[PDB]
Amino acid sequence: IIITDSPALVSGAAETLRHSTLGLTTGAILIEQNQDFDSTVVDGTGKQNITRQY
Amino acid sequence: KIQGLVRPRDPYSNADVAAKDLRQLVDNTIKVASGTPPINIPPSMLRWIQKNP
């Protein structure tokens, strides 16, 4: 039994919280990370101090 | 030359500060032209005295 506090398996609160448990088989759920990662750092001027963003 | 390059800064406050430009300047060098008035040096007036022209 795999334990996970994922908010996708609780779905409710108080007396209507409905925990959901999954019985999976081999290769039931497939996730592929498409390695299209892009991260930019942008900076601004005209202030007292330089401002960056990520 | 840029006059204001250093400004009192406040790391705890975010406020706008006016921008500055880059100027340029030109040096100069006038050209002066001189010369010599025509000089009469006839060979006869020197051979009469028997001198090399």
Short-list A46, A17, A35, CA closest to B15: A46
Short-list A25, A21, A27, CA closest to A6: A21
Method of determination used here: cryo-EM
Bridge partners (DSSP) of residue A43 are A52
> Is B11:B17 a contact under the CB 8 Å cutoff?
no
Strand duo A51-53 + A42-44: pairing: antiparallel
A46 inside 8 A of chain B by CB: yes
- Left, alpha or beta for B19 (phi > 0: left; psi -120 to 50: alpha)? beta
Structure tokens belonging to residue A22: 């999954």
> Is B17:B8 a contact under the CB 8 Å cutoff?
no
CA distance A40 to chain B (A): 23
> Is A20:A9 a contact under the CB 8 Å cutoff?
yes
* Resolution (Å) of this entry: 3.7
> Is B32:B25 a contact under the CB 8 Å cutoff?
no
* Cβ contact, residue pair B16, A46, below 8 Å: yes
